[PDB]
Amino acid sequence: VRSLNCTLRDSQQKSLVMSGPYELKALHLQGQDMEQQVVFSMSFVQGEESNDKIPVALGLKEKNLYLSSVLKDDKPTLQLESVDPKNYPKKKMEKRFVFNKIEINNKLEFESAQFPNWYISTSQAENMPVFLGGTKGGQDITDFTMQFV
């Protein structure tokens, strides 16, 4: 399946890092301290494609960990999920692992295929988790830049 290596940064220049085994946190990084940032493998998977809308999976570079959207207390929730390292990545990923990457004026948004209009979001504050957020509109950050590695 075609994959790109990549880092993500929020629209406020916060870098993404592993908090626990299974959480990402977003924080202002600079310097050599930038080593500490998570590289994704972004996969081009089967789904609903327009010029504006590309379905992707987001895995960690050389880990069998994927971002998925899951119901956790009658709320769409972001988790890191372990997968069988022999079976992944796939072209037909399961729907919970699929995000629609939307280009919206040199920025990216990552909409969950599974929960429409829920986005990968970060907090304005330091050291908070990346979450699934349902409100675009000037409180949580929903847009990102992408860098190639």
Side-chain angles (χ1 to χ4, degrees):
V1 37
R2 296 152 101 218
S3 288
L4 238 32
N5 314 278
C6 80
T7 56
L8 270 338
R9 224 161 260 136
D10 78 13
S11 51
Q12 288 226 277
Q13 226 80 50
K14 315 202 284 305
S15 309
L16 276 23
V17 307
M18 289 233 273
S19 138
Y22 297 100
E23 279 218 308
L24 287 153
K25 278 184 127 51
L27 74 206
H28 285 98
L29 273 189
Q30 204 196 57
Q32 117 234 70
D33 240 285
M34 208 90 120
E35 72 187 352
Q36 84 181 281
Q37 104 201 302
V38 176
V39 188
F40 295 95
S41 74
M42 191 187 283
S43 294
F44 318 84
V45 293
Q46 88 163 30
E48 250 143 305
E49 119 149 67
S50 140
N51 292 339
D52 263 43
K53 214 166 227 201
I54 319 270
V56 290
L58 306 160
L60 295 206
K61 202 235 259 107
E62 236 121 57
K63 320 196 152 276
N64 55 328
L65 298 155
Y66 280 94
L67 300 175
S68 54
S69 356
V70 117
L71 256 173
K72 252 210 188 257
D73 281 74
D74 319 286
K75 263 226 49 180
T77 280
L78 197 80
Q79 52 169 21
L80 270 298
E81 221 194 278
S82 268
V83 302
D84 194 302
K86 276 251 100 248
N87 292 330
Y88 286 85
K90 302 210 238 141
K91 187 184 165 172
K92 179 180 175 58
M93 296 268 298
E94 285 76 18
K95 213 172 78 156
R96 61 189 191 279
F97 293 120
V98 169
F99 305 88
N100 298 140
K101 183 175 62 82
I102 307 146
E103 339 158 58
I104 267 157
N105 238 54
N106 274 35
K107 294 154 178 205
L108 301 184
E109 294 159 1
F110 294 92
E111 199 208 17
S112 147
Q114 176 98 26
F115 300 119
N117 298 124
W118 288 71
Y119 292 97
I120 305 173
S121 308
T122 66
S123 293
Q124 217 109 92
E126 295 304 284
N127 246 260
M128 309 288 306
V130 189
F131 53 105
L132 218 59
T135 125
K136 297 167 53 180
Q139 31 200 119
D140 310 310
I141 306 154
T142 64
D143 57 301
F144 289 85
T145 47
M146 189 187 134
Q147 300 82 37
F148 314 76
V149 297

